[PDB]
Symmetry: D2
Subunit: 485 residues, 4 copies
């Protein structure tokens, strides 16, 4: 089996923290309590002066994605290893179906690519990048038989992934029918397309042109529009990579107004800012280029962290989609050709601890909710993951909140040859990572094999996402007025 007893630490769940040992047997947590016996043969991890937390769940990755004429350098193998070294024990990666391509074929191609390579557990969202009867059927199959309750739609990427309002209305309606959550990349793709054209014509070909062609208003607008279409059909919505104060405030206002919408800032938008696009060194500026862009208002990451603490924003991913320096160089003369994407899978947990807990913005329990539990609740496997409790999966991180580590591309485990968080000194270090009941990272070294992680099959109609939707279907039906003809 492999038995492990994590002894002497303080367990930290989303609700409260308490001292207790944790007994792991066979992939599962089988007991949580004080002073547990060490069974003969079991390995003891000494978690004295440490916190024992559910492993991080990164809701947003693109490992080895073919995009913008090249392929991301962190692949399923290296990317999941880097996750583990950074205290993340699950990733959820996007099946990026091409326009006119079968969603089932694209799903199968992702499972074939990832199944033999992942080092930690994972699951998949599926992008719906076009619409038709076939797509409709395949979404039902994916939700009922293939383990997927999240579909990803794009309002940006005109010509490539974009859907118009009438198509989003149909797609969101069908999400609600199959019990799936609708995820959206919310930027106005017409404004992006025109904006870029204008920045190029004015000779602004560098990364500053990338931010200036699609400033935060462009993200805030599409975010409000997605919310409005989703509310019209009573479909739950998930806005991925919220990058700006104004888009975050759209989400904040919609939630206060009782709309079923969740917002996901990412490690990049919580840990750094878009002033980097104006850096004199082209390579440096290019490293940060992603859609939607990081924003040049320096108060952004702190504000996003305050809203993450207060649950205006609810959980975190990384949008890990990495391109090395020579790949980013594809766009040296033309920002539109810089492959979009930044790093974060490995450093998300330390960045959020330093910028959110050490700073006093959120407590350790809210940290667990926004790095693991809420993802498990929304994507429908809580408390199987996201909670240190008997019968839960043994994906556990032993965490030192007092020690710092400096993030550097010289010491990171990602494939990419630079790091958007270079030089950041973070409190909060993953000292030991356990995945599926096995020690896969300890004493700064990984011990794991490609294919050791498993795909997690979820069911639709996640209760955290749907119980309000369903009650509103039952009491919120519009009524005719009764009238003489």
């Amino acid at each position: 089996a492999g038995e492990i007893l994590i002894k002497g630490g303080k367990v930290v769940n989303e609700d409260c923290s308490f001292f207790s040992d944790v007994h792991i047997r066979g992939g599962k947590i089988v007991e949580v309590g004080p002073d547990l016996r060490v069974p003969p043969g079991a390995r003891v991890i000494d978690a004295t002066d440490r916190l024992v937390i559910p492993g991080g769940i990164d809701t947003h990755t693109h490992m080895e994605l073919a995009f913008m004429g090249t392929r991301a350098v962190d692949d399923f193998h290296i990317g999941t290893k880097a996750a583990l070294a950074g205290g993340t024990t699950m990733i959820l990666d996007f099946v990026m179906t091409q326009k006119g391509q079968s969603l089932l074929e694209a799903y199968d191609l992702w499972r074939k690519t990832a199944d033999p390579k992942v080092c930690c557990d994972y699951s998949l969202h599926v992008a719906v990048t076009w619409w038709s009867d076939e797509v409709k059927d395949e979404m039902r199959t994916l939700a009922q038989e293939r383990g997927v309750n999240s579909f990803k739609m794009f309002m940006a990427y005109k010509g490539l992934f974009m859907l118009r309002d009438d198509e989003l209305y149909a797609v969101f309606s069908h999400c609600k029918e199959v019990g799936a959550i609708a995820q959206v990349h919310a930027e106005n793709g017409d404004l992006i397309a025109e904006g870029a054209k204008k920045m190029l014509s004015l000779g602004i070909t560098g990364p500053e042109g990338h931010e200036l062609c699609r400033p935060e208003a462009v993200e805030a607008e599409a975010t409000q529009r997605a919310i409005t279409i989703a509310s019209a059909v009573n479909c739950p919505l998930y806005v991925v990579h919220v990058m700006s104060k104004s888009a975050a405030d759209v989400v904040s206002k919609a939630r206060k107004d009782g709309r079923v919408v969740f917002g996901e800032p990412i490690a990049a938008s919580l840990g750094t800012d878009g002033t980097n696009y104006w850096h004199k060194d082209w390579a440096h500026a290019a490293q940060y280029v992603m859609g939607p862009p990081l924003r040049p208002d320096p108060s952004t990451p702190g504000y996003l962290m305050d809203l993450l603490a207060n649950d205006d924003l609810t959980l975190t991913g990384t949008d890990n989609c990495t391109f090395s320096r020579c790949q980013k160089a594809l766009g040296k003369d033309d920002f539109t050709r810089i492959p979009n994407g930044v790093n974060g899978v490995e450093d998300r947990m330390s960045v959020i601890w330093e910028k959110g807990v050490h700073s006093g913005k959120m407590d350790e329990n809210r940290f667990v909710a926004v790095t693991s539990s809420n993802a498990a609740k929304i994507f429908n496997f809580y408390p199987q993951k996201g909670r240190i409790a008997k019968d839960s999966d043994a994906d556990v991180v032993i965490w030192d909140p007092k020690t710092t580590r400096k993030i550097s591309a010289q010491t990171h485990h990602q494939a990419v040859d630079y790091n958007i968080f270079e030089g950041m000194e973070c409190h909060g270090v993953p000292v030991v990572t356990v995945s599926r009941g096995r020690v896969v990272y300890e004493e700064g070294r990984l011990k794991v094999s490609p294919g050791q992680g498993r795909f997690i099959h979820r069911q639709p109609f996640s209760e955290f996402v749907y119980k309000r939707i369903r009650q509103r279907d039952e009491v919120g039906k519009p009524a005719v007025v009764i009238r003489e003809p």
Copy 2:
């Protein structure tokens, strides 16, 4: 010439009020001052205990518009007479060009229809309901040679007038090029189209279905999106008929954030509410049907009036587009077929005085700004109209703020056979209306002939609308960062 001396009243301009007489000769105000001599032959209007104000300018009319299978019943003749009887001395009506139709032909057809019928002065906005090189040229001709500096675009009316984001971007860009303001009907036409389809399928065929298929979120969304596209191209924007709290707050927030946008609530949204669509009497409910709909939150008209007082909203029109009871009946089985449009041209001034000044929300001077002066400033003929001052046009109303009048279809001068403000007791009565230097309304009787009013030709680049736009063009150009290759 016709000489008139208005004696003993208190003149009320947008800036301040003061006692003085007003001498009118030849269509113009030629002196303003205390104790003026009555020249032999001049008529004295005794304005003791009255206010002397610029005549109302209704920014938003559709006299005799062919629409939804019939033609509005208030035409240029009757509609302008009704305006005069209600203290409004100018209307600005929309040339509703059809898809694929020449803007110049449609403009000519409106001038031929209106020139021999109007009883008061008027001008025209031109709708841009499709896009092409021809449309581009014709907009330049209209702005430079035909007197028109306002173009009207629709985000609603899918299949009929609607433009997509990329077309709005081009159209707004060209507005800015020709020095015109971009007006928008801001509702999401895809959501309207789907929403109506859904209300019909559920058997909600009455007017309540019309409001429910396009609730205020649908107006607020498109309003934010228009603002965002206009801000992207630095084009000034004018949101016509703001009908809801949430859309008004979008405009309010954009202005505070320094966007060049103006919002226009109408008499309907300031004077009544959408609870009427739920009335047991179908005919009654149908009377209120227009796009965007009046809203069922009863706090709406008061809130819109508070924002009009505070200049979150800046000026007022009526969207006068009237259909008698037997025309509204076209939609007795299907709300989508009810011709959209309500009354207001005649009652706008009294409604706004009662709901805004008598209530203590705004003072008499702000009343003048939101009923005449701001319209003259935005559409580019201030202080020719909108101000009691020497050399200004003699379009003047003698106003009794203490007496009430009850609005009723039994006593109104509009062609329509009902009135959305039926029974409202309003303080503030137009006792005498002067248009082009002639008494056209007094002792409750009109004295005016069809064709007596003139088309007002405006120039582009109105300073109130463009001086900030032009300065931002000069200091707000994006700059490249200077970098080694």
Copy 3:
């Protein structure tokens, strides 16, 4: 011992819901799991088609309080019985120390009064109604030795309980020193005092005068001021009975801005409104009189419920402080003499279920958080109460969410002879209440004895309230700038 097995229900905690039976032995939940064995002698409660939830914790009561010249009619005995019949298993009542009176004496007097009468568990907050060295010491004693980590201060009740800003600053500073939370009744007592004087002078002596003398601005102002003083000293704050949209928005904004403040709406402000004060029947209007008053904007209770769902507001109490019809009549000629206080202890759970869960505003799990768990977290006994889990106290309610019950003073168990929620039909009925491991309410009948409940002694420095405060003390210290003299 008394053993109980609650079988066949769905357990509902703040985090998730799941089918399982619950085994109670000796006052405690000793097992939670599927298909549990019934031990010989144990009573089975059949919870098929029911939810099994932690009993409600009412954070805010005033049982038998001597106030405004009389004494509340629901006393510790009747009041706790009524709580039980309504699915509430703990109350937290205010020790209302008089000006210049020893806090220790007042605490002792409350424990002597309540200990032999309560039918359910309870604890106490202590009011700090004056300040001095003695009060300082006694607060430390109360926090460290008497079980109390909450102190209540008043900005209203000039002459009676009010404290000025400089006294609030000192009191809040000392709360933070002893690890207590500062609770505040937030209305401007100078404006109340003047306002009432003015309403009386104008002959408005009825209950409408009570609301009009202290409209919502008066509550919103003091709420912002308390937040600002508490933030200045880094003391955690708890705003009790939030009664208005504007005060709730103050709390909402402060939380988004990362201030450690919690807001507590009560059953009255979630279930009805202040239009009642304008009722033609004086007695009826008087029934609703409390400070701060219910508000005449009908959108209030729904808005408060939306903010409770979204965690702008965090938990609920009742401010139960009841006066029968003949006691309310003390103020028949003068609203200032109407004893302030309404009912709610019994009906809070059904009111919140009907207005919050059945309406689709919050789900069953958020219902548990805002009726029990958050109170246990803030006042420092979670998960001892507020959670169905092994080792937790057996205070458990078997809840039917589908059946309705009509609230009426004819059928309620409170001592008061009317009910502010008279006639309300609520979904969600407590079918069986278990307190301390005993069935105390079932088949509509109570089975409990005075003194059967126990006082719950808490420790200071509740982690849910203090872990951010303490981290901010460690990294948020102001620093001198280093300068040459």
Copy 4:
């Protein structure tokens, strides 16, 4: 008489701009029109390529005020000269009555000090720093016979000027009775007093301690509280020197909600920020010390300017209260002893033009409203000043908007030996200043004598401030409900 013809410029009023010459005779503008004749003997000022604007009116000065143990160095003579050189032709200075001192004596002492020294026109506000029957009477005398319709109250300066809520309620009530506007210095004086005590105890004795002891929350709170008390008594309110985003947003929200409140940012808060208090050079940091402090958020002055453009904030003063370097040094060991006050009288017009008009935030006409016209409207002498029009006072500035000037203490005309705007390059230069019909500043040289300016006596009940107040008194009276006993 002295006759002047200002020829060839563009006149800029609050409403619009137009080319015309301006004929000045005898202290007054006697004609405005194109191509005016030069009468023999008249001086022509050639205003080709210049704007002709009403002279600036600085609503907020403290010339030669004895304060904090010394006396401001810019006195009535030097201060008014410096005003003139900077295109400001009127100041309104505060009679700072001491606690227990007669308001009439203090007023007389100011008139005796200023009358023989001012070089431009001026008027006075009177501080009400204590309350009693005498103060009540003297306020009536001041409003009806001494020319003063503005009274200044302080919520800060505990022990020195502070008034409590109940005193503010009485004072504001009596302001409304005498037709005066209530001005407030809005910071919580208890929090200031405690905060300073705490910063000193922690060894933070430098200017950073001054900002940190009273951060923007402290200003925002008192600002909301003043608004709430003023709204309770229907008294018009004027918040002087709005220094922070959060206080400005309080004012913004109150106006949108229809409260009669005006907000006045000053040149300091529009032109620089509080990061200066952290400067390594003590003297430099001390230069900026005033109450309320400048704020360390760098986005502050731009935000205040956006709200000034949008009329959330309405007009501008300087709070000119200058102390030279050796006077500021009184507090070298203890920030509480640094005499509070900064410069601005001379540079206000250029700072606001550069930061507001050249930047594209407001147009030239809004510049006139926020630098002259609105002050004349609120303090009750419009259009006597604040407007280029026939019969108005000839206080006129010939303004070059295209040329820049660098502000420096080396070239300024103020008595103070440094300048908070040192080094700022501003577009917009006053080339010629005319005061009372005389050229007092031209070719960089002043030509004016002490005592040449006059005190301007105003009447109470300014219409811009009172017409809404009075209508609300007439329709907004609370009504009793009619009930059987």
